[model samples]
Target: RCDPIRISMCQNLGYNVTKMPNLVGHELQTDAELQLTTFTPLIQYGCSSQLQFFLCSVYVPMCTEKINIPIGPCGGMCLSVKRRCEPVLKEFGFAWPESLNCSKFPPQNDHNHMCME
Candidate 1:
């Protein structure tokens, strides 16, 4: 069990704090009674640095994670917008990552992703 002070401290120190809310009778309790904090930031930072090394050429210091390799000059501003998988795809290139087909491309469905009532 952790108090709010302890939870706040842990969060300030770059922890992913999970707070368990209290329950009284049948009513929903808003306040948290138990808290858990993980050192997720250190792990993320370390992974980020190592990932940058793996990225080689396309790695930028500012973004560090966003890898948008241009398709080519012929495509007229065609871009691949993948979050973190682009670097791995670039290095391996249809070898270990057998799932990806770098040569053949897929047609865009362009279906409306937005929902309306």
Candidate 2:
């Protein structure tokens, strides 16, 4: 059952009442109602005078949580290194040497003579 006090608060605050679910069964209130109550202080303070404070404080973050972010060498750390080394190899008069494979470059200390430091 929705608390009359809480429902009244939403209406008085000019928030959309239809979006809130009806009180059913023995339920005292809802998370939405609780959120509305929680933001009451911010609402009353006039800190967020536009579109109510609850959306800014609660709803937006809840919606945006699914962003899949790639967290790795996202840029050109390896590509930049390969490009820099290419010029160095040619300038140092290293033989044309047929092949350059930067994608297969190792991330460890290379004692192999294939790559030049």
Candidate 3:
């Protein structure tokens, strides 16, 4: 269930090496990159300090043999980034895409659940 960080955007985001079939179900780095490339501009825009963290948490996710599965961003983290960046997206005539709607994320991190901040 674990793999190396191959996506350039996903590297060094503190996931400590990761896995796929990530939270978004990207089974391969190539597949994940196809979708991840689009978010680079938003991340580059610096809408929020946590924007890259939030994106990498979901798109790359965390992996550990103990869990044997990927862990995603806690819901609170998702909302935090959304709150800060949604307005920036509007400035560019874009909406915070439906696929990333914060409601779908975990409510918060926990010792057992293990989500990114």
Among all candidates shown, the one with the greatest TM-score: 3
Error of 1 at 86 (Å): 3.8
For model 3, what is the error of residue 22's alpha carbon versus the real structure, in angstroms, after optimal superposition?
Answer: 2.0
Would you give me the overall lDDT of model 3? 0.80
* TM-score against native, each model: 0.16, 0.26, 0.88
Off by over 4 Å in 2: 1-6, 13-29, 51-117
Tens-digit lDDT string for candidate 3 (1-117): 467888786687676677767767677778888998888788888988988878778877778877765778888988889998999999989998876778887687776666777
Global fold similarity of model 3 (TM-score): 0.88
Candidate 2: the clashing residue pairs are 1-27
Q: What's model 1's lDDT at 6?
A: 26
Against the unseen true structure, what C-alpha lDDT does each candidate score? Answer: 0.23, 0.32, 0.80
Residue-level lDDT of model 2, residues 1-117, one tens digit each, is: 111323444444322323123211113335555544654543454432332422321221111123321111111233444443445445555522222233433443334312111
Q: Candidate 1: deviation at residue 10, Å?
A: 32
Once fitted onto the true fold, the runs of candidate 1 whose alpha carbons sit more than 4 angstroms away are: 1-83, 88-96, 102-105, 110-117
Error of 2 at 35 (Å): 1.8
